[PDB]
Design a binder for this molecule. Structure first.
Ligand SMILES: [Zn+2]
Ligand SMILES: [Zn+2]
Ligand SMILES: [Zn+2]
Ligand SMILES: [Zn+2]
Lengths: 82, 96, 69, 104, 93, 96, 78, 105, 94, 69
DNA sequence: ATCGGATGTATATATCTGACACGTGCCTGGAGACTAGGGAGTAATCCCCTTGGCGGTTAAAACGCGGGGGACAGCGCGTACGTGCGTTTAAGCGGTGCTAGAGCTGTCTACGACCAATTGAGCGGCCTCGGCACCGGGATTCTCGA
DNA sequence: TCGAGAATCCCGGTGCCGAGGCCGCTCAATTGGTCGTAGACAGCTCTAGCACCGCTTAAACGCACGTACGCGCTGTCCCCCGCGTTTTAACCGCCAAGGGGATTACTCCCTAGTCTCCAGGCACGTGTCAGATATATACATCCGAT
């Protein structure tokens, strides 16, 4: 098994997204707060892809299960065969 | 010793990163995270490359769109620095 | 002696939660007044069981009051 | 033997739309004039967005249409932005803007 | 086997507005998904709207009003006119 | 004579209206407003009573749900008075 | 018209919401906010009542128009 | 001749659900034991809310449920509040709550 | 003419949990409209699952995996456990 | 062995009212979670002793709740 | 405000490849032609429900004045964050190997659509009395200037 | 600190109209066969997802230093809350007229269904040129000394 891989999202990686967002100054206690928001968005999406991928008797996640899961939450995504 | 004023360099990175379209997180570190999370619902599972790429393409948009709205709550309170109490308010007003 | 132990055993049943028999009685229900431990009570609230184990009266989360000693 | 789409004068296929609409479990029966009406609306929207995308590509001295031009054309127009509200385009990007108070 | 798409029709339309430009394969998939989403959520409103009135057929009138409930403002006023102008030609011939 | 400190009456009436359940806006002027608004789409229309009642209920719910979101962003600026800029910020964040 | 939504009526809604102090410019802002929402609901209600060749807008049309906007309403049937 | 609901030990009607599934343009064919699975779910959800509302109908010294008691049942529990997240119950009201900064010292 | 509703079944369910408790007309009209809303969502989600896998019948599996997709968290466990216990009783009956 | 004698006395003082040492802890206070006996509660209300002894706070008529065991 | 030095951002010309645009074979899905039956268009009618008008109470809205708390502006201090540099770590790219699982094909059997005959369950109409609405009196609690 | 005053709650009595039960009666759910296609199962092919290794080298990391900004404090003043008096029209009860919503017959023509035929859209193969990459050059910009 693999553990504590949440620390792969580094401080420069988080700050680069904020730069694109538009902010100018970033407080110290933002990185830990942000790492806890991405870890929750990735459970809701994946728990539906896994539900889709086992009702079809398969044991490999495809690129269509993710699109369906994203569509079920009002987040439709164009470009991957939807 | 030619230094810059504290903020003129950060004001240029916004222009640099609002003009290019590319992924901002490292592919292998992001891909390991998905495999770690998705081993609790069902063990010994497999992924396509496109599934991981599509999962990464949406988190970027989500985080970027979230960092745009937390920058308005900081402006509302007469600030330029964004504190953790802005992310909570922005996330609570839209219901999540 | 046995009587000394019996009173020790008798009082032991009064301090510990009957469900757990491991922690002091800490949590009480307003509706019935019965006192149990905080830990055993919460897991019941997540199991969708809102009936008192003793008096069977229905209750809700807000009816939970902490006690001391 | 003439095609059903050339009679109407469209570029989109009428028969394919008819059989897709008659096999998707929408209604028990499908009228004759419904595919002709529906295939003429699908053609207008795509041209509407594909003209703006072409103009955006032309303003950048390019001669193709990469996904960035689609995002620019969609986000620069009010009605199109409202229609495509909660949808994300892969490799799209973001519309350049900076808060007025942040500048010196 | 095979699989169907709107690639040829989208290209044919593109060579009408801008006769000298092209399009990349990655944007082609986006254009192919957009027309599948719009057609899916326009024809999903007509079936439900015909169920309210205890009907059994979806005709052109059920689509003319289903377009008016989705497209905002100026877009609908053009889509309705262009859809109506196409049925008249078809009926005559 | 006898007076009350500014705020006590406000708190008691807050406590009062959050325990009742009837409609807050008068009925006849609202009916007139609906009949006037509907005139610009198709003249010579008629309304059932239940339609007007449903419209009133929906409007009350929407306005009540919005006034309790503008208050939450009024406090964020260390202030205790709601303002049009607070309303505008709440509406912008919600995603109108 | 829009002047029937009086200041005490507006302030009672704010009291139910839970505010304690109200600036003097709020009422003009809120009237123009309510007028926009009513138009959005009524236009769809009228389209629904006009598709069926009727002349009276009924409660079910209002319920459907509210439902398709992401705001369902229990208590009026359907 | 018994009824299918009685044979399955339920309270809700199975035949009506079976007919509603068929006359709804959901699929070409409907399985045998699909209504007996769908009717056992519609009843548990109803029994949950009708049990959570009877406590509110009693804490106010009443003996007849009114919409206000249903309003307080689906707002004091996360599971049901997250399911009915965009529903406005008529004649419901709001939930008593005052911000802690507004109170006097 | 005739009009159909679950008002007779909701009342039968109510008298199993609270033996002596009534219910008013508005509350009945709300409880009636809630069941239809849930029913229209479950079947509507189950149809797309059948369409996705190029199938044509809505059997008991699609209902199970559609319940596990809409109800949040801990409710789904109880709903599945209550459905799969009624089905097995039905199939082994008279 | 005095080892378990102290536990019983520790158990005894926990359940006995710390005021009278003659009655069980059967009348608790809702405001701060302390528990005493009903004997030592109403005597204080005679002189309007709204201040609790342990943490020393005020109370009321609805802040006294009956508890069992 | 006025120059000046340095830094990062456009601007112009090779070169070079991998993806876009075009051409051909072939097969299956779309176009023609005819038939039967049921959904839908049209006319009549009747009776519920919507609109309009009138008079009395009185509850809520409008207007004015006093003053005290809260919004806002200006100052000062010190800690937290931006910028730059040297060192270290792991990502990205290429190449090879092996095998578990997706995708397609052929059988055939059990399950769901469909139709004729029964009967009992659920719906419409009526009665009735008890739970809740309302009003009048005390008893307790909450606030503010001493 | 606590008494005067105002708001709020607990209790008792009276009345009324809507929930709860009852009965008769259609018509929809239940039995009982029959048949034909969807789908479960076994087998085969092949591809793409996983594991490992070696080599740059781009980027993550730790540290020093300075300063712009967040936060707490103080002061003036103006605008929103509380309360009393006067003017308005909302609400309730009553009455009457007619419009159109819902229901029932009757017919007719438009869509599903079947068989035949063939051209259009799809898979596969190939040339070639639009843009990515590198490099030298012109210039807008910024922070400092004055
Ligand atoms: Zn315990
Ligand atoms: Zn108990
Ligand atoms: Zn004592
Ligand atoms: Zn205490």
């Amino acid at each position: 098994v693999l553990r504590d891989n949440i620390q792969g999202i580094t401080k420069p990686a988080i700050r680069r997204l904020a730069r694109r967002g538009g902010v100018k100054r970033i407080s110290g206690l933002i990185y830990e707060e942000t790492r806890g928001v991405l870890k929750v968005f990735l459970e809701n999406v994946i728990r539906d892809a896994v539900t889709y991928t086992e009702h079809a008797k398969r044991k490999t996640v495809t690129a269509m299960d993710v699109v369906y899961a994203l569509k079920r939450q009002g987040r439709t995504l164009y470009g991957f065969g939807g | 010793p030619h230094r810059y004023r504290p903020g003129t360099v950060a004001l240029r990175e916004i222009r640099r990163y609002q003009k290019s379209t590319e992924l901002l997180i490292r592919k292998l570190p992001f891909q390991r995270l998905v495999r770690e999370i998705a081993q609790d619902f069902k063990t010994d599972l497999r992924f396509q490359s496109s599934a991981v790429m599509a999962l990464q393409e949406a988190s970027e948009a989500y985080l970027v769109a979230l960092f745009e709205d937390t920058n308005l709550c900081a402006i509302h309170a007469k600030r330029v620095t964004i504190m953790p109490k802005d992310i909570q308010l922005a996330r609570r007003i839209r219901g999540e | 002696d046995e009587a000394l132990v019996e009173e020790l055993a008798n009082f032991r049943t009064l301090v510990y939660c009957s469900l757990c028999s491991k922690n002091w009685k800490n949590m009480a229900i307003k509706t019935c007044g019965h006192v149990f431990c905080e830990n055993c009570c919460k897991e019941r609230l997540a199991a969708r069981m809102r009936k008192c184990p003793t008096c069977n009266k229905a209750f809700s989360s807000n009816d939970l009051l902490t006690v001391h000693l | 033997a003439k095609t059903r789409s050339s009679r109407a004068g469209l570029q989109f296929p009428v028969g394919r739309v008819h059989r897709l609409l008659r096999k998707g479990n929408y209604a028990e029966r499908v009228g004759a004039g419904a595919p002709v009406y529906l295939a003429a609306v699908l053609e207008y929207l795509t041209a509407e967005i594909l003209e703006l995308a072409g103009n955006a590509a032309r303003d950048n001295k390019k001669t193709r249409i990469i996904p960035r031009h689609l995002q620019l054309a969609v986000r620069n127009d009010e009605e199109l932005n409202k229609l495509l509200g909660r949808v994300t385009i892969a490799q799209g990007g973001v519309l350049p803007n900076i808060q007025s108070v942040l500048l010196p | 086997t095979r699989k169907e798409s709107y690639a040829i029709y989208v290209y044919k339309v593109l060579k009408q507005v801008h006769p000298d430009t092209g399009i990349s394969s990655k944007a082609m998939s986006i254009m192919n998904s957009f027309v599948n989403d719009v057609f899916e959520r326009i024809a999903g409103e007509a079936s439900r709207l015909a169920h309210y009135n205890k009907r059994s057929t979806i005709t052109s009138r059920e689509i003319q009003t289903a377009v008016r409930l989705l497209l905002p403002g100026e877009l609908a006023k053009h889509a309705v006119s262009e859809g109506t102008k196409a049925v008249t030609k078809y009926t005559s011939a």
